[PDB]
């Protein structure tokens, strides 16, 4: 049975959330592959199927619980179980399709959405960009209930897509970027719910390119600059791994060392 990490929004603190994200990172990768001080997720080539996934069980005040499945090679949310039903994003290719049949094998009902979990499509379905979907403990609390009641018929599709956007950012992206974990910590500490600003969005949009630039860097320098936005949306370019070491927590395997 795949490793399970638990988190509850009920009585959640900055510390309980940080403990959660750190536990997720610890199950995504051994951390034995470190490039320029930044740990790398396992290479998909050579990774046996019984180590492909981790499970994140989320609970809230209503004692509703859902279990997200994360692919350890990229930390992304592949699908989730609620009760006797599992739901999966549409796979890109038949290899991803085969992998997810190893998830929630005893579940009674398995549903595959027609759409993938990419941000553009989710924002279309939710009817809102990430810039207009508030994040925080409250939103996560409401996302958990929405995911749960999808299986009973009480969650409509736009609400479901919004809830994925919230879960993916507060779990997957926070796992990938300690900056994003810091952004979620700040919201918890100031009892705030608020959408991500461009500094969060451009990081989320650039994880793969940042991981490539770092792993292919020489003497700390990128082959070509990567452009990000500040909080005010103004653009700036990163040329050096040193700027990103306090920002990125995990990289996808892009190259060998």
């Amino acid at each position, epitope marked *: 049975q795949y490793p399970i990490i638990n988190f509850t929004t009920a009585g959640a603190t900055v510390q309980s959330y940080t403990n959660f994200i750190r536990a997720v990172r610890g199950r995504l990768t051994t951390g034995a592959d470190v490039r320029h001080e930044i740990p790398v997720l396992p290479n998909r080539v050579g990774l046996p199927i019984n180590q492909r996934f981790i499970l994140v069980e989320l609970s809230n005040h209503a004692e509703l619980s859902v279990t997200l499945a994360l692919d350890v090679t990229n930390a992304y949310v592949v699908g989730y179980r609620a009760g006797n039903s599992a739901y999966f994003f549409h*796979p890109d290719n038949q290899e991803d399709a085969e992998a997810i049949t190893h998830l929630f094998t005893d579940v009674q009902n398995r549903y595959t959405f027609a759409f993938g979990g*990419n941000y*553009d499509r989710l924002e279309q379905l939710a009817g809102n960009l990430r810039e207009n979907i508030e994040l925080g403990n409250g939103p996560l609390e409401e996302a958990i209930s929405a995911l749960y009641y999808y299986s009973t018929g009480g969650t409509q599709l736009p609400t479901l897509a919004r809830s994925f956007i919230i879960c993916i950012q507060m779990i997957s992206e926070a796992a990938r970027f300690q900056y994003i974990e810091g952004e979620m910590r700040t919201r918890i500490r100031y009892n705030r719910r608020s959408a991500p600003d461009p500094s969060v969005i451009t990081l989320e949009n650039s994880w*793969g390119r940042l991981s490539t630039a770092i792993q292919e860097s020489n003497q700390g320098a990128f082959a070509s600059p990567i452009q990000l936005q500040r909080r005010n949306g103004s653009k700036f370019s990163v040329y050096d791994v040193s700027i990103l070491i306090p920002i990125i927590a995990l990289m996808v395997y892009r190259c060998a060392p």
Partner: nanobody
Amino acid sequence: QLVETGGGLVQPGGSLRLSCAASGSIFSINAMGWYRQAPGERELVADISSSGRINEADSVKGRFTISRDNAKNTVYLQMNSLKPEDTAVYYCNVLAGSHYYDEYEYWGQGTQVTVS
């Protein structure tokens, strides 16, 4: 899998319209956009998500207008009030991926734009 149209040489104040259509494995297609590089760095001109988010370089705000036809997986760039500083080779750019936003990246062949 990217077919670009457009490009040319204009005088200051002239206008060009670029287009680039994507075909193939673009189930999880995300943001399409345009980069430019002049001789001697490559810079983002504009991109647009399928959901309506637009990024644009300050240099071209109010002059260039990017738009997208999601059914055709095609992005257009209406370049009006062109200036000599807009001279460069322009590339369309296509991001895609279910697992993360920029998992897949495809570059166009580049078309020359010159203003003088």
